């Protein structure tokens, strides 16, 4: 009786699992690794910090390799809880990574929002929100420090730690653009908030200090890294109407082996708004009450999973005029793609199409090389904007091909592509192999 | 058209990903493993079981190796929903692990709370809460069996299973201390609950039964395991006040390669209270209404992510008087460190500083060896306790450097360190390589 | 005179005008004071 009675229940069907065994589970071997230490060091920001300003920093040579980078901001609330939406992210309009004077990469606040929407999840996403927003119903005048991690290839894993030590003759810089306005901090919709404070900013870089063996090798030997980059093109949405299903063919000026494409439609007025506004409990300012308006979101609840307020009916990607895959509905891109490939939950209005088995990982797993595609095009069909957004019944009881009349406010389209390039470093200098 | 239209788009940039391929993702070879079986066997507990008692159990020799250990408790609610907080965790005040007559490790109820608060996440964290508390609005008299998994190194991975088989002359024992009181079970704040049931306790050990050759090897060959240990000392907190920012230099009596430090401040009266009480929802008993009293927590909602109620303004760690890293704010340790190193969400009042790239894993990834550091010191700066906790506006709309007047109740400081040691087992005996 | 105008770079004699660019390779480690005041006691067993 007991576990031994299972062990003896052994025969031919077990050979495939345990015959001529190779491994066990009950004895582990850890690998010995090169000695290193990690330190979080503050960088000096040049330029004036404030809303709408451009500032920058040259990463100091204090350690050998760099990994994580966090931009801290101190913001204050210009209104009560519910008036902000990830404002630290909205503020950091963009970040540009420059090495040796070459643009290696560049992120935008909207990418940070899109990235989060697709790749962070569960409590990571919640903890992530806690570092960029006010999530405990804070009130006007509240002050908090926010931490916006950067998401450049070397900021996600030690595996790609940038070997500043191997770049003896090159600069490494971060250029940061701060938004002219941040919702619930210095502006409320279009209105400025009198007395709003200017942000305090600090950027931190986590350095790896190597022991002699590796410090020596990194400085002396050439390196090659397979890294990722973000490509981004902004365009106008073929805005849908109550009288028609707008359609659009967007030529995609992308290059390089692309892991995936991602896109969203948005109202540029309101950061993170990828859906229509409606008088349903979480879809607009004052929703559910007599004060409800479908011209302004309940900012703290800007994001939603209610696809009824999204505008993509269907889409396909064409490569050199040929369909890549059969046309699928917007919900395929919003719900199925990330189910199958990421395992997180993507909010309405954000779409993903992967060319990779694991778009969320570092390891390449299938790519579409746009450097060899003369004409790649994204083909979109929009929903019909005929639903009266001020009547929750109209929204909640609607059909697959329609959306809110207020969905016509989502006039901006952001198309992203994440691709793989090669960073090469030799004799103190480096940059990327392909343009 | 279709997938073939992508394969054709091949060029120089693809060679780096797919040229001279090593693997395919579409054919997996699974490793053949040894033949083993797992059985859950109940252990006998010596000593009276009840609140405040110390009991012990010797692990039987039913199998060859042991992994998981789960302690069962049966408790009845001494009050209504909202009166308890992780009561089974509170009850298991501590547990000692003795192998071969030598202490290997020791955990405390607060460690279980800290550990969970810091390293578990998402659904695993919720399932854990389900096994240690009442989370379905149970009422007074409700009876529930709780499970408190132990978190010793051999309870985390089968790879570190204790080879009872290779410990022929050495006993393995568990010593447990049961709390004198458990909130909402036998006491309500300081008051006893007459008639409260005494706990029923039982310890379960999951045994591994190995087949013929693997058992032989374990019994005869020497083994060394790289395992984790918890170091812990309780300290007096340099309690903050409305009139000042307290500060404190705490010399840390730690040794061994340390993956990380973790700490919290708490109100020793209220288990798991790491934050100040306030009249905001969940922050005190009756919070948000007329009866709100900021002297007692809403026990069922004792924990929170509302940083305003935390007391750490900033901190740093010094080695031999030298700063290890630049001083960072309390929210760095609470939100950022976990973001970077764990990926979960850590409750306010709970802090982490890692010396490791991935401290949450089994595999060492950089450590601080305190056996080679003469003076390791944790330097803390506290927030000013000037906020009138009974006035939500005072709390929710305030600045970064202040907290609740009730934050001065968090007078206990718990500092932990998680390190590595080596468990050497051979010739019928075993114990740790270093002291 | 000649007006040498020495550039940046430490860890070498005065005959080198510049050694590193933005990141010189020369790095120094702290002496790890009171290293002798640490015993590093090994662990032992009990009578089985």
């Amino acid at each position: 009786a007991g576990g031994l009675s299972q062990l003896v229940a052994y025969g031919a069907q077990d050979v495939y699992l345990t015959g001529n065994p190779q491994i066990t589970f009950f004895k582990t071997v850890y690998r010995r690794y090169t000695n290193f230490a990690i330190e979080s060091i503050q960088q000096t920001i040049n330029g004036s910090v404030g809303f709408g300003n451009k500032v920058s920093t040259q990463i100091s040579r204090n350690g050998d390799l760099i990994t994580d980078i966090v931009v801290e901001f101190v913001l204050t609330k210009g209104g009560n809880g519910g008036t902000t939406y990830y404002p630290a992210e909205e503020l950091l309009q963009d970040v540009e990574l420059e090495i040796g004077g070459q643009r290696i990469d560049k992120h935008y606040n909207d990418w940070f929002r899109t990235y989060d929407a697709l790749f962070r999840m569960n409590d990571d996403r919640y903890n992530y929100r806690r570092m960029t927003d006010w999530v405990n119903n804070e009130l006007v005048g509240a002050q908090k420090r926010f931490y916006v991690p950067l998401i450049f290839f070397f900021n996600q894993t030690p595996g790609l730690a940038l070997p500043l030590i191997a770049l003896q003759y090159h600069e490494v810089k971060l250029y940061f653009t701060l938004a002219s306005q941040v919702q619930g901090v210095n502006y409320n919709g279009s209105s400025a908030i009198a007395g709003a404070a200017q942000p305090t900013m600090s950027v931190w870089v986590d350095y790896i200090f190597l022991d002699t063996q590796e410090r020596t090798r990194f400085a002396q030997l050439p390196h090659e890294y397979l890294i990722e980059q973000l490509q981004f093109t902004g365009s106008e949405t073929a805005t849908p109407s109550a009288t028609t299903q707008a359609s659009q063919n967007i030529r995609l000026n992308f290059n390089h082996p692309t892991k995936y494409l991602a896109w969203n439609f948005n109202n540029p007025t309101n950061y993170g708004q990828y859906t229509a506004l409606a008088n349903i409990p979480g879809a607009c300012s004052g929703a559910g009450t007599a004060a409800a308006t479908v011209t302004t979101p309940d900012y703290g609840n800007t994001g939603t999973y209610n696809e009824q307020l999204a505008v993509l009916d269907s889409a396909k990607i064409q490569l050199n005029g040929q369909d890549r895959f059969a046309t699928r509905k917007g919900s395929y891109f919003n719900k199925v793609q990330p189910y199958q490939s990421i395992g997180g939950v993507t909010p309405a209005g954000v779409y993903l199409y992967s060319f990779a088995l694991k778009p969320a990982g570092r390891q390449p797993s299938g790519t579409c090389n746009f450097s060899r595609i003369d004409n790649a095009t994204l083909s979109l069909t929009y929903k019909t904007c005929s639903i009266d957004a001020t009547s929750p019944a109209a929204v909640l009881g609607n059909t697959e091909t329609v959306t809110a009349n207020t969905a016509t406010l989502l006039t901006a389209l952001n198309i992203y592509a994440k691709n793989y390039n090669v960073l090469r470093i030799m004799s103190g200098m480096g940059g990327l192999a392909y343009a | 058209a279709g997938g073939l239209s992508q394969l054709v788009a091949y060029g120089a940039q693809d060679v780096y990903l797919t040229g001279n391929p090593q693997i395919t993702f579409f054919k997996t070879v699974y490793r053949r493993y040894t033949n083993f079986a797992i059985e859950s066997i109940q252990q006998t507990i010596n000593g009276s079981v009840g609140f405040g008692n110390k009991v012990s159990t010797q692990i039987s020799r039913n199998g060859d190796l042991i992994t998981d250990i789960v302690v069962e408790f049966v408790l009845t609610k001494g009050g209504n929903g909202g009166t308890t907080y992780y009561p089974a965790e509170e009850l298991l005040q501590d547990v000692e692990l003795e192998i071969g007559g030598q202490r290997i490790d020791k955990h405390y109820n607060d460690w279980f709370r800290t550990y969970d608060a810091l390293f578990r996440m998402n659904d695993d964290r919720y399932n854990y809460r389900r096994m240690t508390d009442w989370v379905n609005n149970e009422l007074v008299g409700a009876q529930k069996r709780f499970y408190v998994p132990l978190i010793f190194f051999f309870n985390q991975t089968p790879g570190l299973a204790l080879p009872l088989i290779a410990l022929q002359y050495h006993e393995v024992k568990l010593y447990f201390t049961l709390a004198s009181q458990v909130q909402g079970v036998n006491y309500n704040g300081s008051s006893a609950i007459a008639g409260a049931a005494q706990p029923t306790m039982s310890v379960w050990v999951d045994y591994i039964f190995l087949d013929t050759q693997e058992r032989t090897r374990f019994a005869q060959l020497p083994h060394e395991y790289l395992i984790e240990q918890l170091q812990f000392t309780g300290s007096e907190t340099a309690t903050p006040s409305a009139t000042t920012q307290a500060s404190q230099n705490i010399r840390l009596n730690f040794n061994h390669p340390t993956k990380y430090l973790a700490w919290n401040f708490n109100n020793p009266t209220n288990y798991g209270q790491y934050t100040a009480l306030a009249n905001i929802p969940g922050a005190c008993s009756g919070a948000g209404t007329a009866a709100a009293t900021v002297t007692t927590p809403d026990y069922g909602n004792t924990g929170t992510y509302n940083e305003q109620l935390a007391v750490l303004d900033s901190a740093k760690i010094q080695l031999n008087g030298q700063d290890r890293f630049a001083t960072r704010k309390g929210s760095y340790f609470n939100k950022v460190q976990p973001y970077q190193s764990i990926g979960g969400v850590t409750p306010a009042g709970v802090y982490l500083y890692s010396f490791a790239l991935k401290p949450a894993g089994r595999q060492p990834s950089g450590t601080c060896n305190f056996s080679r550091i003469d003076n390791a010191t944790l330097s803390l700066t506290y927030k000013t306790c000037s906020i009138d906790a009974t006035s939500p506006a005072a709390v929710l709309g305030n600045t970064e450097t202040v907290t609740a007047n009730t934050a001065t109740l968090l007078t206990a400081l718990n500092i932990y360190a998680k390190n590595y040691n080596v468990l050497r087992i051979m010739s019928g005996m075993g114990g740790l390589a270093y002291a | 005179t000649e007006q040498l105008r020495v550039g940046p770079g430490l860890g070498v004699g005065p005959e080198v005008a510049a050694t590193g660019g933005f990141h010189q390779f020369y790095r120094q480690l702290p002496l790890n004071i009171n290293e002798y005041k640490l015993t590093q006691l090994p662990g032992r067993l009990v009578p089985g």
Partner: peptide
Amino acid sequence: FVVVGKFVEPIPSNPGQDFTLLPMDQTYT
């Protein structure tokens, strides 16, 4: 002591011209 090699990479598909970026050792005694 720095190692300078050839950086074995695949042949470019359409062009033959690219950016060389020769190594340099910035040090003057």
